[PDB]
Amino acid sequence: GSSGSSGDVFIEKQKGEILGVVIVESGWGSILPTVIIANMMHGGPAEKSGKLNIGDQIMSINGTSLVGLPLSTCQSIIKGLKNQSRVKLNIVSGPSSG
């Protein structure tokens, strides 16, 4: 049961619906500037999943590294998960020390 830490995350949602989550540029400066959660929808899949947190970054999406990819792009790869229910994404607590 109780389990969830910087690693392989699984967001269980329903098809047709969005990931109900907003992402933003990982402040060009951190180790791997990909993308981090800027805000969570009040009743979305991500907010309910509880697998991520405001500030955490995504290393990849279902095996699709976002390293280097622009904020606009990374978002597109996340917007195409609406047609799917279950999605796998790698999360990594942003740069806490600093």
Give the CATH number of the domain where residue 88 resides: 2.30.42.10
Determine which helix (DSSP H) or strand (DSSP E) holds 71, and give its type and residue range: helix 71-79
Method: NMR
Flag whether 72 is in a domain: yes
Flag whether 98 is in a domain: no
Flag whether 58 is in a domain: yes
User: Minimal CA–CA distance to 36: which of 21, 25, 51?
Assistant: 25
Beta bridge partners of 39: 22
**Domain span holding position 29:** 7-93
Flag whether 2 is in a domain: no
Token pair in block for residue 44: 């979305």
CA angle 64, 71, 20 (to 5 degrees): 80
Flag whether 1 is in a domain: no
Q: Do 20 and 46 meet the contact criterion of CB atoms below 8 Å apart?
A: yes
